[PDB]
């Protein structure tokens, strides 16, 4: 029905595809950051995962914030001591954009254990807005996932939750996910979830919609599959912990498949 906007979903999909290209971070920016590393960023994103669950924010909000952070670090060098300030300002902006009831600024100051002041958070807010030129309506993995979900026959909540989980995992690791567009990670995530839970594969109907096939997805799929296999070992655990919850159907407790068979 109209909550799935039949008259607009295809226009909207096409527009999101165009925008993810415009909103894409620079793949190799971390090498150009003298003082920060993939691991420091992984630490930051995992902390933002916790902030989201502490404040019951939307997953969408979390995805926007990461988008903002990675675009900002594409043009602005940041000392390790200031990375968390960028991330805090990013989460604030994402909350103001996406949340019905965004947390107040004082709560964002509070979660940084008074490392930064309210004036610092608000000046970083301004700078991020300047750097992004207020282009905050970025496509995320989640915007693609929810559309792809409409192609399940029939809907399956374990599939949906597992895809969301795998998509979130990818936010942690700039190498190698910076290489992939949201729409592609979403595709890989959806296929991997569907295969894991039901044995089924990337539907032809989504080939029609997206133009992507298992061939085009294969590289991403191989990375996500490794990420899923290694996830109990990864230094950052906040997403697995979050997805143990019944709200997400306990999906982080599911067993990954040993192989994908092509």
């Amino acid at each position: 029905g109209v909550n799935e906007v039949p008259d607009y979903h295809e226009d909207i999909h096409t527009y999101l595809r165009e925008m993810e290209v415009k909103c894409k971070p620079k793949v190799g920016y971390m090498k150009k950051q003298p003082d920060i590393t993939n691991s420091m960023r992984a630490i930051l994103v995992d902390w933002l995962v916790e902030v989201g669950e502490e404040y019951k924010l939307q997953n969408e909000t979390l995805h926007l914030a990461v988008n903002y952070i990675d675009r900002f670090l594409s043009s602005m060098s940041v000392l390790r001591g200031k990375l968390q300030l960028v991330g805090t300002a990013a989460m604030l902006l994402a909350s103001k954009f996406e949340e019905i009831y965004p947390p107040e600024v004082a709560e964002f100051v509070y979660i940084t254990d008074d490392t930064y002041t309210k004036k610092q958070v608000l000046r970083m807010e301004h700078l991020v807005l300047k750097v992004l030129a207020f282009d905050l309506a970025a496509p995320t993995i989640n915007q693609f996932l929810t559309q792809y979900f409409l192609h399940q026959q029939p809907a399956n909540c374990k599939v949906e939750s597992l895809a969301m989980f795998l998509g979130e995992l990818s936010l942690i690791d700039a190498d190698p996910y910076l290489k992939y567009l949201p729409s592609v990670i979403a595709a890989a995530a959806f296929h991997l979830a569907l295969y894991t839970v039901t044995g089924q594969s990337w539907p032809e109907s989504l080939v029609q919609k997206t133009g992507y096939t298992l061939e085009t997805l294969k590289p991403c799929l191989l990375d996500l599959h490794q990420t899923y296999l290694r996830a109990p070992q990864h230094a950052q655990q906040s997403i697995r912990e979050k997805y143990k919850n019944s709200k997400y159907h306990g999906v982080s407790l599911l067993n990954p498949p040993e192989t994908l068979n092509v």
């Binding site: 109209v2 799935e4 607009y8 527009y15 939307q58 608000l122 207020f134 309506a137 929810t146 409409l150």
Partner: protein, 302 residues
């Protein structure tokens, strides 16, 4: 962000919105007449308001001849100016001051046709407006009419998730919102435009309620109280009550007596109870009511 405030000359105050003052102004270098929306941030202790963040980010993407154009954003450390294209009037003022003998049908067709174009463009770009009313529709001297005030707008996902409740100015608010729907979509903007269509014909609000329940009651008296047949789901909705009076639907030719058959057909489809059956902006553009609109499409702004 190529602008700076030194190149503008304030001409006069033209309004006051959610951040405060709007001025008409003139670019001293190019001659261009603009509207400056000022947003003071020193009075803000929560930083840049979310209304402004949404308005700016969403309007940057919406380039359409029937959407008021955001030309620039001047971001000082203490103030935020939005530069917009200038339009001399809004539909409410036009209706009050000039449409005493009425708005001629040709002009109503043209205006509604352009509004649907603007709205379809929004929906096609995953944007809900959520405050369509005559005050927020600007008209120029050339006969264009354009969606304005995106302070209440929202970027949606597909399918929609739960958003802020009780949006839309009351008289223009859809029944699914009034009944506390978990989910609302593009159909809420269509409902508003339907209200606006009726209002252009009569010069009075279709459903002028003084309360949420009064508003529902007014709607029910005109369109009949909805049941499971006209609107599957209705009686299960969070704020549906079985105690609701059961009013008979009236012949639609009584709702807006001077409207012709094509007009009534289109109006009825805009005000369908079921959000799922209500017409989309896209499909409305093909309605026979528009068969005779000739007014040439406004050109896009730079």
């Amino acid at each position: 962000g190529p602008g700076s405030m030194e190149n503008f000359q304030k001409v006069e105050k033209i309004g006051e919105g959610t951040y405060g003052v709007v001025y008409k102004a003139r670019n001293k270098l190019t001659g261009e007449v603009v509207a400056l929306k000022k947003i003071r941030l020193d009075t803000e202790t929560e930083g840049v308001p979310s209304t402004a963040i949404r308005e700016i980010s969403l309007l940057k993407e919406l380039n359409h001849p029937n959407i008021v154009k955001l030309l620039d954003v001047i971001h000082t450390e203490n103030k935020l100016y939005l530069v917009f294209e200038f339009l001399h009037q809004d539909l409410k003022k036009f209706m009050d001051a000039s449409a005493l003998t009425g708005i001629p049908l040709p002009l109503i067709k043209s205006y509604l046709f352009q509004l649907l174009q603007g709205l379809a463009f929004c929906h096609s770009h995953r944007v809900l407006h959520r405050d369509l009313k005559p005050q927020n529709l600007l008209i120029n001297t050339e006969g264009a009419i354009k969606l304005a005030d995106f302070g209440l707008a929202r970027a949606f996902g597909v399918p929609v998730r739960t958003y802020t409740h009780e949006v839309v100015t009351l008289w223009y608010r859809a029944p699914e919102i009034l009944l506390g729907c978990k989910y609302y979509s593009t159909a809420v903007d269509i409902w508003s435009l339907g209200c606006i269509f009726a209002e252009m014909v009569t010069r009075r609000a279709l459903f002028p309620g003084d309360s949420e329940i009064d508003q529902l009651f007014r709607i029910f008296r005109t369109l009949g109280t909805p049941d499971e047949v006209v609107w599957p789901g209705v009686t299960s909705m969070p704020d549906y009550k079985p105690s609701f009076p059961k009013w008979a639907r009236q012949d639609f030719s009584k709702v807006v007596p001077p409207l012709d058959e094509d007009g009534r057909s289109l109006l009825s489809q805009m005000l369908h109870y079921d959000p799922n059956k209500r017409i989309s902006a896209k499909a409305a553009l093909a309605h026979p009511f528009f068969q005779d609109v000739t007014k040439p499409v406004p050109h896009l702004r730079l």
